[PDB]
Design a protein around this motif. Structure first.
Motif, PDB file in Angstrom:
ATOM      1  N   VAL A 127      72.927  84.592 -21.795  1.00 39.00           N
ATOM      2  CA  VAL A 127      74.150  85.126 -22.384  1.00 39.00           C
ATOM      3  C   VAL A 127      73.925  85.543 -23.833  1.00 39.00           C
ATOM      4  CG1 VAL A 127      76.571  84.651 -22.821  1.00 39.00           C
ATOM      5  CG2 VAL A 127      75.441  83.631 -20.840  1.00 39.00           C
ATOM      6  N   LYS A 128      74.446  86.712 -24.203  1.00 40.21           N
ATOM      7  CA  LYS A 128      74.331  87.241 -25.556  1.00 40.21           C
ATOM      8  C   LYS A 128      75.695  87.250 -26.232  1.00 40.21           C
ATOM      9  CE  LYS A 128      72.300  89.710 -23.077  1.00 40.21           C
ATOM     10  NZ  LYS A 128      71.820  89.513 -21.682  1.00 40.21           N
ATOM     11  N   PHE A 129      75.675  87.151 -27.558  1.00 41.83           N
ATOM     12  CA  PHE A 129      76.871  87.192 -28.388  1.00 41.83           C
ATOM     13  C   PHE A 129      76.926  88.532 -29.109  1.00 41.83           C
ATOM     14  CE2 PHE A 129      77.151  82.289 -29.016  1.00 41.83           C
ATOM     15  CZ  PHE A 129      77.331  82.157 -27.655  1.00 41.83           C
ATOM     16  N   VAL A 130      78.123  89.116 -29.194  1.00 39.62           N
ATOM     17  CA  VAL A 130      78.303  90.394 -29.869  1.00 39.62           C
ATOM     18  C   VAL A 130      79.490  90.329 -30.820  1.00 39.62           C
ATOM     19  CG1 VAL A 130      77.225  91.749 -28.044  1.00 39.62           C
ATOM     20  CG2 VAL A 130      79.671  91.276 -27.966  1.00 39.62           C
ATOM     21  N   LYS A 131      79.462  91.215 -31.816  1.00 35.44           N
ATOM     22  CA  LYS A 131      80.479  91.297 -32.854  1.00 35.44           C
ATOM     23  C   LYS A 131      81.003  92.722 -32.951  1.00 35.44           C
ATOM     24  CE  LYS A 131      79.180  91.201 -37.126  1.00 35.44           C
ATOM     25  NZ  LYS A 131      79.752  92.481 -37.622  1.00 35.44           N
ATOM     26  N   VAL A 132      82.318  92.856 -33.119  1.00 35.48           N
ATOM     27  CA  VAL A 132      82.955  94.167 -33.180  1.00 35.48           C
ATOM     28  C   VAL A 132      82.801  94.753 -34.577  1.00 35.48           C
ATOM     29  CG1 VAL A 132      84.558  93.590 -31.342  1.00 35.48           C
ATOM     30  CG2 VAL A 132      85.204  93.151 -33.707  1.00 35.48           C
ATOM     31  N   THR A 133      82.460  96.035 -34.634  1.00 38.27           N
ATOM     32  CA  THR A 133      82.336  96.751 -35.895  1.00 38.27           C
ATOM     33  C   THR A 133      83.313  97.906 -36.052  1.00 38.27           C
ATOM     34  OG1 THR A 133      80.806  97.969 -37.330  1.00 38.27           O
ATOM     35  CG2 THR A 133      80.538  98.235 -34.948  1.00 38.27           C
ATOM     36  N   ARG A 134      83.739  98.540 -34.961  1.00 37.50           N
ATOM     37  CA  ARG A 134      84.653  99.671 -35.053  1.00 37.50           C
ATOM     38  C   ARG A 134      85.459  99.785 -33.769  1.00 37.50           C
ATOM     39  NH1 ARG A 134      84.763 102.971 -38.595  1.00 37.50           N
ATOM     40  NH2 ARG A 134      85.815 105.005 -38.633  1.00 37.50           N
ATOM     41  N   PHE A 154      75.142  93.494 -31.834  1.00 41.68           N
ATOM     42  CA  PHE A 154      74.454  92.426 -31.119  1.00 41.68           C
ATOM     43  C   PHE A 154      74.263  91.170 -31.955  1.00 41.68           C
ATOM     44  CE2 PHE A 154      72.641  95.185 -27.660  1.00 41.68           C
ATOM     45  CZ  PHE A 154      73.035  94.366 -26.622  1.00 41.68           C
ATOM     46  N   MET A 155      74.415  91.269 -33.280  1.00 41.27           N
ATOM     47  CA  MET A 155      74.418  90.176 -34.257  1.00 41.27           C
ATOM     48  C   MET A 155      73.090  89.424 -34.263  1.00 41.27           C
ATOM     49  SD  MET A 155      74.668  86.994 -32.630  1.00 41.27           S
ATOM     50  CE  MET A 155      75.420  85.893 -33.824  1.00 41.27           C
ATOM     51  N   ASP A 156      72.163  89.822 -33.395  1.00 37.78           N
ATOM     52  CA  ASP A 156      70.810  89.287 -33.380  1.00 37.78           C
ATOM     53  C   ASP A 156      69.744  90.358 -33.530  1.00 37.78           C
ATOM     54  OD1 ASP A 156      69.931  90.269 -30.616  1.00 37.78           O
ATOM     55  OD2 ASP A 156      71.674  89.057 -30.065  1.00 37.78           O
ATOM     56  N   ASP A 157      70.006  91.574 -33.058  1.00 38.40           N
ATOM     57  CA  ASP A 157      69.148  92.736 -33.270  1.00 38.40           C
ATOM     58  C   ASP A 157      70.001  93.780 -33.982  1.00 38.40           C
ATOM     59  OD1 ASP A 157      67.318  94.761 -33.305  1.00 38.40           O
ATOM     60  OD2 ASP A 157      66.967  94.806 -31.142  1.00 38.40           O
ATOM     61  N   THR A 158      69.948  93.765 -35.315  1.00 39.74           N
ATOM     62  CA  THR A 158      70.861  94.582 -36.110  1.00 39.74           C
ATOM     63  C   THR A 158      70.648  96.071 -35.861  1.00 39.74           C
ATOM     64  OG1 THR A 158      70.939  92.850 -37.794  1.00 39.74           O
ATOM     65  CG2 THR A 158      71.659  95.044 -38.452  1.00 39.74           C
TER      66      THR A 158
END
Lengths: 138, 103, 199, 70, 142, 69, 60
Positions: free
Chosen positions: G3-10, G28-32
């Motif tokens: 499972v991967k974690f993601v962050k909203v930017t737009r 992806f907050m891990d691979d910028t």
RNA sequence: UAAUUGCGAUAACGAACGAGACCUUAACCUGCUAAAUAGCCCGUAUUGCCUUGGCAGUACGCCGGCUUCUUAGAGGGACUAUCGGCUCAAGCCGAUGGAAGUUUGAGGCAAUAACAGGUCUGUGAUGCCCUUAGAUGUUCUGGGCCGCACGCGCGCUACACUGACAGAGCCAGCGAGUACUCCCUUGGCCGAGAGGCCCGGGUAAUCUUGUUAAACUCUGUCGUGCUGGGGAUAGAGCAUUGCAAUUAUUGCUCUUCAACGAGGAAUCCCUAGUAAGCGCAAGUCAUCAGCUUGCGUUGAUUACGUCCCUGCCCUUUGUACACACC
């Protein structure tokens, strides 16, 4: 001469007039003491201002309060807001408000409703409230 | 010249007309150097009547609410007997006045 | 002696609801912080906040009030959170007496586990399902969890000699791990399964 | 939450005809209008002053199409 | 320090005073007991056998805390709602003879006196002192 | 669909066997697990309390809860 | 599963027949150096964090 | 943008109704004018306890002092104010300050033009027709509009433990009230209850009324059983309103104890002190509210959107219609 300040607190229809007087540290409302005057579960929120601030800052001050009008839950909020105004106004006017300024700042950062009232009432519509009747035929 | 501590009351539908009457009356009295206790103003009573608009009943059901408002604004005074007749003159129209000696 | 003599120990301690300090909250996972607010504590949930006025003003609110509000429903329980606040505090004592762990730990870890991550939305397919198995936001997670949680407690206790306090208490402790005897988790697990099908 | 032609045209004429006499300050602007205009309502009177202070705030950095003065 | 009636728990005071008053044992009973309905809105007689004595504390206390009181006002204080069946409920007041005669007896034992000055009945000096003593005892026992 | 209003010997010795080993005791648990009536449960509650084997947490007109001693 | 974690930017816009679904751009907050766009159901703010199980659907 | 509300592009320029402005009402003022038909302080007499010096109460003051609370007049206050990212701009959102930042909340009035919309049972508004002395004029007695195998609409009570039952603690607001009549009714006395008798106050911020409302809170009884949840149907008796209660007006007293376990296909109302719960006053009224118009108490889940369904308006388009798809 005699030292005393008058402040009031309001709610929906709960008016609480209070005179904060120089005393020796006793607080009671309508003459009867604070020990009982609440529903038994809500009495912690009576203790809000004195508990956060410390009893040592209620050293030599007396307060008498009269409250009427409204409902049970409305009245209890009214009287606690009167407590805040009573202590802050007496200290501001008769001692350094520098302590008041930390008091006021700390008191409103926890909860702002201690010094300001909430205005809220109702309004008469022609539908039985804000919802109309059942459609006769549709 | 025995005082009786009279009290005079007024009634009207208007508000601004009555109110200016009250101020001029207090100053007309005060000019001859008489003591006066100020303008005790009684509360305003509001009375309403609601009725249906349609005369028959078809269509949606809609109401209207007419209103009327009344003011009292009575006055009291400490004075001798018959100076009141000279002073209470020059009143407006419609405005009613009743005098109570309160002996 | 203005204040009651018995309740005096708290003053020399950080603010708490007498029986439980909010200090040392769980460290289990992420993505629900910024949406569960405990950093500013409260004694009793009976605070007349104006959270409804804007979108996310109800996001800045201690979870304790949320539970109390959600419990009162179905006509009879409209506006009477006093029973609701009564039950929640009392139910906390049961689980504390039934388990050495902090009851806030019991409530928090349960709600973070009983939320779905993907769901399905009914776009028009002319009578059929073009259900693309869309994702879910962290905020909606807690909203649906609390709502469905409280409904599980009332339905179970309904028409039973058991009462809601221990029924709600049992609901939280079963949801701690995959007991499968909890209303929440059973319905929770199927949701992804039907969603995973239309993936 | 949007103004109308009445306020805007009233704002437009006052700035064009009495430019030096007022400044960015909102209360000094509030007072000058009631002396130089004939308004019959406190809310309308306040609204005209508010727009002129907004209008003058933008004129200070570049000229605007609508305005023309001596 | 000094205390008064307003410095004790409400439900404690009525129970504490009920025990003391029955141990003294001097007040009439007109025989109405065992046949009273407690009010036109209620259905069954109270459970506790010693309910009649308990009641005495409650009424005595309020007359101390009010400027004046009369027989009719107790009716509308003591009333409550009545389930008229499938129609909506209303508010109806309690029985009048019951409250009347009980306080008749009470005042015959030197607790309050008539007030032909304005109407109603107010408590008397000796009665006021009596309640304080029972209230004072509760404080230390706590 | 009946719960014995009276306590018999069989229930009594089962009672004094396990009630020192439970983690929580309530009216519901007694009527459920022991097949006993609710009225007797409140009676049993008060009698076992005074003999000093369970400890009170809170008392109230609706629910009583007790744990070990 | 990883499972991967993601962050909203737009945020981009709410699609759907009745406007329940929303287009969001996530990080992806891990691979910028990577960035993709996904769909969400409930209310969404900026700087929010999402959890992603499967990273291979990429609806329209 | 709630809006033909605005910015702009432009063979158009400048204007007029509607919308907005306007008015009523709800929130702020330790600043002005105040008030024994509103309060507080103060001063006398006085009661109880600790005793201390105080605390809790009672009666008085009418040129003792004051208007914070209550109440009404003149005014002030919010204008989106300052900010941070979008953007030509109009704006939108978000944080701070502030009693108040959805048009601050809710209403009143409301354009050009139509409908075979409704009303002749509101009118001594009104045409024509009809009846007129065995009257379709008016008046008195009795009845009916409520009669019932059955289909449909607006509501009321419940299906219980988030409950029922028994004690006790105890908090509102909007309003209404008697002359030729009989209103709101306190207090005292009789009465199980409903009711009855005798003085009295108020034409009213003065008396009813602090309308001590209901919900609610504390202590107990009952305990999964259509049971103490439920109150339809009926018998007996006692009163009140009224000339008159049978087809029971209503109330009171005892007994009788029906259906009903969350309700199919369908379908409604609603965005914050709002839904929902709970009661109160007024209207009709001699009595009868399960009705409507208003008032207050407790007080939430979910959204800050779209044109998929169901309506509506603007543009393009077609017409052998113009009494206009009836």
């Amino acid at each position: 001469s005699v030292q005393a300040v008058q402040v009031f607190g309001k709610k929906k229809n709960a008016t609480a007039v209070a005179r904060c007087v120089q005393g020796k540290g006793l607080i009671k409302v309508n003459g009867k003491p604070l020990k009982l005057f609440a529903p038994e579960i809500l009495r912690a929120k009576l203790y809000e201002p004195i508990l956060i601030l410390g009893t040592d800052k209620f050293a030599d001050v007396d307060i008498r309060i009269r409250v009427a009008g409204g409902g049970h839950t409305s009245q209890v909020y009214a009287v606690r807001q009167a407590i805040a105004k009573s202590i802050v106004a007496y200290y501001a006017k008769y001692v350094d408000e520098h302590s008041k300024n930390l008091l006021k700042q700390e008191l409103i950062q926890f909860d702002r409703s201690l010094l300001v009232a909430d205005p809220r009432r109702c309004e008469p519509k022609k539908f039985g409230g804000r919802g109309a009747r059942a459609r006769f035929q549709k | 010249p025995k005082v009786h501590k009279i009290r005079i009351t007024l009634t009207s539908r208007k508000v601004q007309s009555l109110e200016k009457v009250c101020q001029e009356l207090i100053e007309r009295a005060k000019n001859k150097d008489l003591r006066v206790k100020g303008p005790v103003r009684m509360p305003t009573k509001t009375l309403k009547i609601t009725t249906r608009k349609t005369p028959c009943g078809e269509g949606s059901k809609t109401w209207d609410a007419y209103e009327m408002r009344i003011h009292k604004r009575l006055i009291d005074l400490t004075a001798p007997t018959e100076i009141v007749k000279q002073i209470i003159i020059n009143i407006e129209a419609g405005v009613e006045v009743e005098v109570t000696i309160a002996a | 002696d203005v204040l009651p003599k018995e309740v005096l120990a708290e003053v020399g301690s950080v603010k708490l609801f007498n029986r439980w300090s909010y200090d040392d909250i769980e460290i289990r996972d992420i993505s629900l912080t910024d949406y569960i607010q405990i950093r500013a504590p409260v004694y009793i949930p009976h605070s007349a906040g104006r959270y409804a006025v804007k979108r996310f003003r109800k996001a800045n609110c201690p979870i304790i009030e949320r539970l109390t509000n959600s419990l009162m429903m179905h006509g009879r329980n409209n506006g009477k959170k006093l029973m609701a606040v009564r039950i929640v505090a009392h139910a906390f004592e049961i689980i504390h007496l039934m388990t050495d762990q902090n009851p806030i730990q019991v409530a928090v870890d349960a709600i973070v586990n009983c939320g779905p991550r993907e769901d399905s939305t009914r776009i028009g397919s002319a009578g059929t399902v073009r259900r693309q198995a869309v994702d879910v936001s962290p905020l909606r997670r807690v909203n649906q969890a609390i709502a469905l949680l409280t409904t599980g407690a009332r339905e179970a206790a309904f028409r039973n000699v058991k009462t809601i306090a221990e029924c709600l208490a049992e609901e939280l402790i079963n949801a701690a791990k995959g007991s499968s005897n909890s209303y929440a988790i059973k319905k929770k697990d199927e949701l992804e399964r039907v969603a995973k099908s239309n993936r | 939450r949007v103004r109308t032609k009445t306020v805007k045209k009233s704002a437009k004429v006052i700035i064009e005809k009495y430019y030096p006499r007022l400044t960015l300050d909102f209360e000094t602007n509030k007072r000058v209008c009631d002396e130089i205009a004939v308004i019959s309502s406190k809310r309308l009177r306040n609204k005209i002053a508010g727009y002129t202070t907004h209008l003058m705030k933008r004129i200070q950095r570049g000229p605007v199409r609508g305005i023309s003065f001596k | 320090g000094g205390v008064t009636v307003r410095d004790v728990d409400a439900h404690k005071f009525v129970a504490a005073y009920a025990a003391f008053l029955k141990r003294q044992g001097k007040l009439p009973v007109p025989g109405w007991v065992d046949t009273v309905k407690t009010g036109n809105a209620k259905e069954l007689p109270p459970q506790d056998i010693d309910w009649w004595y308990i009641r005495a504390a409650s009424v005595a206390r309020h007359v101390y805390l009010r400027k004046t009181v009369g027989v009719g006002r107790l009716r509308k204080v003591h009333g409550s709602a009545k389930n008229r069946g499938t129609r909506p409920s209303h508010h109806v007041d309690a029985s009048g003879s019951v409250d009347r005669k009980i306080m008749q007896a009470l005042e015959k034992i030197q607790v309050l006196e008539k007030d032909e000055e304005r109407g109603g009945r107010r408590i008397t000096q000796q009665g006021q002192r009596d309640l304080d003593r029972i209230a004072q005892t509760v404080a230390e026992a706590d | 669909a009946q719960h014995s209003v009276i306590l018999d010997k069989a229930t009594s010795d089962k009672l004094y066997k396990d009630v020192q080993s439970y983690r929580l005791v309530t009216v519901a648990t007694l009527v459920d697990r022991l097949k006993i009536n609710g009225a007797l449960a409140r009676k049993c509650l008060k009698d076992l309390e005074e003999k000093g084997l369970i400890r009170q947490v809170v008392g109230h007109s609706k629910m009583k809860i007790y744990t070990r001693a | 599963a990883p499972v991967k974690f993601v962050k909203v930017t737009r945020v981009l816009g709410r699609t759907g027949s009745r406007g329940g679904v929303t287009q969001v751009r996530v990080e992806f907050m891990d691979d910028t150096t990577r960035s993709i766009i996904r769909n969400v159901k409930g209310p969404v703010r900026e700087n929010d964090i999402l959890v992603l199980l499967e990273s291979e659907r990429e609806a329209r």
